[PDB]
Amino acid sequence: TTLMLLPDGMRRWSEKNGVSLDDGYAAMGDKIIEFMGWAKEEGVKTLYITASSAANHGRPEAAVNTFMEAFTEVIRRCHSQFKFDFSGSLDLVSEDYLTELSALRDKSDSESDFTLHYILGMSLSHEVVGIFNKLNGKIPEMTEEILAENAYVPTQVDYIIRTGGAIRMSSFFPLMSPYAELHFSPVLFPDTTRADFDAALKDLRARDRRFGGYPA
Amino acid sequence: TTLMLLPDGMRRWSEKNGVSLDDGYAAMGDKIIEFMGWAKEEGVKTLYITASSAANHGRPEAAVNTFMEAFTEVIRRCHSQFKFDFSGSLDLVSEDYLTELSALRDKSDSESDFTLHYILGMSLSHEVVGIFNKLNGKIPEMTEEILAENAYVPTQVDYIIRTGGAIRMSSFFPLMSPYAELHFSPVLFPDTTRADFDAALKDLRARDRRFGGYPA
Ligand SMILES: [Cl-]
Ligand SMILES: [Cl-]
């Protein structure tokens, strides 16, 4: 199973509890590690996590480093437990975070049958723009196969969990996975319990799935 | 307000009521006309309807003509009551139907405040592929503005209503509207009542909305 987690709710959890944004993101880091264990136990093989939108990288440098440091900490803690990978709008990410993440990809277990994959600077319009400008005037035509090899999410997504209560995709729709089953939880990400996750998976596993076929 | 309608449930409604798919598609036709009235009354100004996926046009000819004929009939019957437009994977649609729709756009009321706009052969991958190949080697670079002027859905979508109970986007996510608010209705589209529509709007209208800002 391939699962994509949209872990929304950090700021509002911090505000709710009267604690700093650094605390919220620390709680998010701990919850990601717990969630990863739950996913593993339920047979998820690939866990995509939307670390950021393209819009998030236009925030103040200080606030960018808050989330970046929190997402990187998770990988510093657990890179030996999985194959780590990342992609997205890498042009938006500071060199020092790109160097660290590359090192952590290299230090992670390429023989793990579990993949943890961060999407950074996610956004369809930014994604398409980027792919266009990389290949524009360079190749003779685009095909769905060439699109898929340049897409931020390199494989098909079976399920999406969005926490935090918004019922919208925001910047995080996977370009090449039209038939991903969507589960929206009202729980703020750092409050997610194992029962919230189990309810999500019970819903998702019972859906009448649809797979796509050959392009048009 | 801009509303996109994903009117799923025709095939299952016909099966449930023991009738032909032609009868399913005519009940859908009658209901689009009714829904359009309902949307006018609640302040909808542009109503996008997802008439087909790109995948829909790989079905056999007979099956294609059933849906193309039923959607085109709505517009034959009502074109004087709104401004009509259409877009999408026009490369997949037969010349006869493009000519007729093009005539119906012309004969519709271009001075109406209400737009009914059909998306044909919707699919992000096929969309992006098409936009790429149109513009490949033709411009020095893509920007968000240029993407937006070539996208199938030409304006921002505020709300999406998907009937028929699936909780997924299928081929139908609007490329340039990350923050479109999603409402999933379990009702099969030909059974949709005013009360279903009102509850959809009561939910969509109370959402905490978010808007996009300048690209990166
Ligand atoms: Cl959001
Ligand atoms: Cl579907």
Side-chain angles (χ1 to χ4, degrees), chain A residues 133 136 139 142 168 170 178 181, chain B residues 133 136-137 139 142 168 170:
Chain A
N133 294 334
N136 165 32
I139 65 173
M142 177 65 76
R168 61 186 179 229
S170 302
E181 297 295 335
Chain B
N133 290 326
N136 180 25
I139 52 180
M142 173 87 74
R168 56 177 178 244
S170 302

Side-chain angles (χ1 to χ4, degrees), chain A residues 98-116:
Chain A
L98 288 175
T99 295
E100 211 181 349
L101 292 171
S102 303
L104 290 166
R105 184 156 61 195
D106 176 85
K107 294 161 156 124
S108 73
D109 179 11
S110 49
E111 308 307 315
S112 179
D113 295 300
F114 198 88
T115 294
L116 185 88

Side-chain angles (χ1 to χ4, degrees), chain A residues 106-175:
Chain A
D106 176 85
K107 294 161 156 124
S108 73
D109 179 11
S110 49
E111 308 307 315
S112 179
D113 295 300
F114 198 88
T115 294
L116 185 88
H117 186 131
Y118 284 170
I119 316 292
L120 295 166
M122 208 168 169
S123 156
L124 285 178
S125 62
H126 209 267
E127 180 176 7
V128 169
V129 167
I131 296 174
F132 180 94
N133 294 334
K134 172 180 178 133
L135 300 174
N136 165 32
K138 266 71 260 213
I139 65 173
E141 67 189 342
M142 177 65 76
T143 66
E144 155 166 325
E145 296 56 50
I146 299 181
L147 185 54
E149 77 184 32
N150 288 275
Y152 290 173
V153 191
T155 72
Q156 231 79 325
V157 176
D158 300 299
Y159 307 148
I160 293 179
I161 296 178
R162 183 175 180 153
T163 53
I167 305 142
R168 61 186 179 229
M169 296 315 307
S170 302
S171 303
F172 308 107
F173 197 78
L175 175 66

Side-chain angles (χ1 to χ4, degrees), chain B residues 139-212:
Chain B
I139 52 180
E141 73 180 16
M142 173 87 74
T143 61
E144 179 170 292
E145 189 176 32
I146 285 172
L147 187 48
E149 78 206 7
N150 290 276
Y152 289 177
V153 188
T155 69
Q156 67 142 134
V157 177
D158 300 304
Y159 307 150
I160 290 170
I161 290 164
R162 185 183 178 134
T163 59
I167 306 160
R168 56 177 178 244
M169 295 313 314
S170 302
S171 302
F172 301 119
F173 193 77
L175 172 61
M176 301 308 282
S177 295
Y179 304 110
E181 293 296 331
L182 309 175
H183 176 86
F184 300 92
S185 168
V187 171
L188 302 183
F189 182 72
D191 289 331
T192 309
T193 62
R194 183 54 176 267
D196 296 320
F197 177 78
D198 286 340
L201 264 66
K202 188 179 144 79
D203 172 24
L204 292 157
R205 241 137 220 185
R207 298 288 181 78
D208 202 286
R209 296 284 306 280
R210 186 181 166 194
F211 292 82

Side-chain angles (χ1 to χ4, degrees), chain B residues 22-107:
Chain B
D22 285 342
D23 293 357
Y25 279 86
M28 174 211 71
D30 290 357
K31 191 60 64 168
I32 289 171
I33 293 164
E34 211 182 341
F35 195 96
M36 211 175 68
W38 300 340
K40 263 161 172 136
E41 296 186 357
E42 287 276 75
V44 179
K45 132 170 184 60
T46 304
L47 174 62
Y48 293 109
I49 295 170
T50 58
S52 63
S53 62
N56 287 165
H57 294 271
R59 287 184 180 179
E61 192 165 348
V64 182
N65 287 313
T66 298
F67 71 77
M68 288 302 293
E69 189 62 25
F71 277 115
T72 305
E73 269 286 300
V74 170
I75 305 308
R76 296 197 205 109
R77 293 167 51 187
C78 294
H79 59 258
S80 68
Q81 322 247 164
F82 52 73
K83 186 174 95 75
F84 178 63
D85 210 337
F86 61 95
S87 56
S89 296
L90 299 192
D91 63 296
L92 301 177
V93 181
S94 64
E95 170 264 32
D96 285 329
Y97 272 112
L98 288 152
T99 300
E100 183 168 15
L101 293 163
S102 174
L104 293 152
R105 172 156 66 194
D106 177 83
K107 299 156 167 146

